[PDB]
Amino acid sequence: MATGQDRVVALVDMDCFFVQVEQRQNPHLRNKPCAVVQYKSWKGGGIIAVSYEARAFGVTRSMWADDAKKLCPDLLLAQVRESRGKANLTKYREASVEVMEIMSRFAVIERASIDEAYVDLTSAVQERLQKLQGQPISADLLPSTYIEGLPQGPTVQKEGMRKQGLFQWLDSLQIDNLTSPDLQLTVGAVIVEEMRAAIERETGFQCSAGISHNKVLAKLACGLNKPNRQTLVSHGSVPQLFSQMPIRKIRSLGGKLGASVIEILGIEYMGELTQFTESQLQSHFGEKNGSWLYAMCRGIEHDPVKPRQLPKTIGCSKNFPGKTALATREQVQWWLLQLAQELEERLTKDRNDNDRVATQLVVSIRVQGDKRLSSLRRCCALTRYDAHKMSHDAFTVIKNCNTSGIQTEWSPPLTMLFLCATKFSAS
DNA sequence: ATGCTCACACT
DNA sequence: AGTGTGAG
Ligand SMILES: Nc1ccn([C@H]2C[C@H](O)[C@@H](COP(=O)(O)NP(=O)(O)OP(=O)(O)O)O2)c(=O)n1
Ligand SMILES: [Mn+2]
Ligand SMILES: [Mn+2]
Numbered sequence: 001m002a003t004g005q006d007r008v009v010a011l012v013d014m015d016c017f018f019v020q021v022e023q024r025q026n027p028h029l030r031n032k033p034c035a036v037v038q039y040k041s042w043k044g045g046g047i048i049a050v051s052y053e054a055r056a057f058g059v060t061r062s063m064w065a066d067d068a069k070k071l072c073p074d075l076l077l078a079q080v081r082e083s084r085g086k087a088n089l090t091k092y093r094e095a096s097v098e099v100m101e102i103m104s105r106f107a108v109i110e111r112a113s114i115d116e117a118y119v120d121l122t123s124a125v126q127e128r129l130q131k132l133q134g135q136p137i138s139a140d141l142l143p144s145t146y147i148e149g150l151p152q153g154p155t156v157q158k159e160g161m162r163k164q165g166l167f168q169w170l171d172s173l174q175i176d177n178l179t180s181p182d183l184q185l186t187v188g189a190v191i192v193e194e195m196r197a198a199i200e201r202e203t204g205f206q207c208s209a210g211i212s213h214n215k216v217l218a219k220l221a222c223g224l225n226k227p228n229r230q231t232l233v234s235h236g237s238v239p240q241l242f243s244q245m246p247i248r249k250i251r252s253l254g255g256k257l258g259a260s261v262i263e264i265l266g267i268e269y270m271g272e273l274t275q276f277t278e279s280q281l282q283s284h285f286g287e288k289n290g291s292w293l294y295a296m297c298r299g300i301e302h303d304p305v306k307p308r309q310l311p312k313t314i315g316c317s318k319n320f321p322g323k324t325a326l327a328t329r330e331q332v333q334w335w336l337l338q339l340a341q342e343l344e345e346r347l348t349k350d351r352n353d354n355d356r357v358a359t360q361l362v363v364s365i366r367v368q369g370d371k372r373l374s375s376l377r378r379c380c381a382l383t384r385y386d387a388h389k390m391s392h393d394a395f396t397v398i399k400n401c402n403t404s405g406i407q408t409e410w411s412p413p414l415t416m417l418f419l420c421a422t423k424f425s426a427s
Numbered sequence: 428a429t430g431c432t433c434a435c436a437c438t
Numbered sequence: 439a440g441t442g443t444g445a446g
Contacts, residue, residue, distance in 0.1 A: 038429080038431080039429090043429085046430055048429085061429090062430085086430095086431085087430070087431060089431075089432080112434085311433070313433065318430085321429085321430095323428095
């Protein structure tokens with residue numbers, strides 16, 4: 001029986017990333033309830049990142065700033081930069097590259113979002129397991145690590161609980177067995193503290209981390225003790241951990257699939273899936289899903305950490321909800337060129353920095369009356385980094401979508417535009 | 428009437 | 439090639 005303990009995998013995720021990025025630049029926002037918002041003039045703007053002090057009052061993402069101000073009257077706000085009539089995230093991307101580069105010096109990372117990367121420490125761990133002989137791992141190596149499920153058996157504040165668990169774990173450590181998966185997790189964890197201190201020391205950003213044996217468990221583990229702590233989730237913590245873990249909380253189970261898992265099987269918690277045979281799960285959700293479900297509810301997941309620090313695509317979009325929809329064609333030309341211009345500015349940076357060029361341009365739109373995030377995706381060739389050509393070509397491949405027989409108008413009105421550069425190739 | 432993204436599977 | 443799902 002292969003037991004999902006071959007790998008040592010960490011997920012590092014920045015604590016309230018956009019807020020921290022603003023708080024480093026505006027020190028008065030530090031250690032105070034703040035949020036970041038986009039576009040201030042509708043309802044104060046929508047909230048895309050919330051500090052932990054603001055979360056104490058009930059402030060969340062997707063809220064409008066004016067509503068958040070009602071929960072938390074003393075709340076401070078930073079507005080994302082605006083350029084060419086639209087949001088501009090350059091600041092946060094550039095902060096992310098800071099974090100990704102540091103992480104890159106320790107091991108091969110898979111960038112999973114603007115603020116998180118997976119790292120595979122299998123190799124680094126065994127190299128460390130030679131470097132310090134066969135000597136103990138002191139608690140002072142894990143000053144911010146929690147051991148999930150510990151303490152157990154026979155102090156009422158959180159750091160007390162942390163210590164007792166870490167003491168229990170370390171006391172139980174089979175130092176003599178460079179084979180044992182729990183020892184490897186521990187050594188992985190020692191590396192992640194170093195990795196995390198390097199991030200805060202070199203960027204001023206704080207973050208959390210999950211250390212386990214696969215991408216999914218490390219993701220779950222990272223969120224258990226946010227902010228500014230890291231959590232080790234061992235194979236043996238899984239049964240109790242999943243026994244009350246709602247299905248929706250596992251990566252990729254938070255949408256329709258997890259909902260059908262709950263409806264069809266009539267269960268609630270991750271651990272309840274172990275009841276079912278693999279074929280049974282493959283009966284209800286297909287070969288790959290039933291397989292993945294069957295092994296995931298036992299802590300086993302085989303998705304690898306992909307060596308990928310650079311995005312596979314560079315994209316640019318703006319929504320036009322309500323009466324703001326675009327319904328003249330000269331209006332569609334202008335915003336197309338607004339988007340093409342930022343894309344060109346970002347593509348030029350990418351080729352200079354990363355020795356690659358995008359070869360295919362994707363143009364996507366939504367139209368008032370449709371329901372789905374995109375209403376239509378079309379493609380063309382990306383041959384010159386010129387905003388005027390990309391926008392012109394973006395128009396050409398969608399101009400037939402105009403139902404309206406009038407020359408000047410555009411109906412149905414367009415509720416979104418999306419340009420994405422892709423199919424990168426070494427240059 | 429939240430925004431703006433990014434990866435991936437299916438077909 | 440184009441759609442849909444899941445995510446931060
Ligand atoms: N729906 C979302 C989710 C995140 N983001 C951006 C801003 C977030 O700060 C940044 C990182 O997202 P996140 O890790 O999911 N949450 P954040 O880092 O803000 O706080 P934590 O909850 O991770 O501490 O992505 C976004 O713009 N739209
Ligand atoms: Mn984060
Ligand atoms: Mn994140």
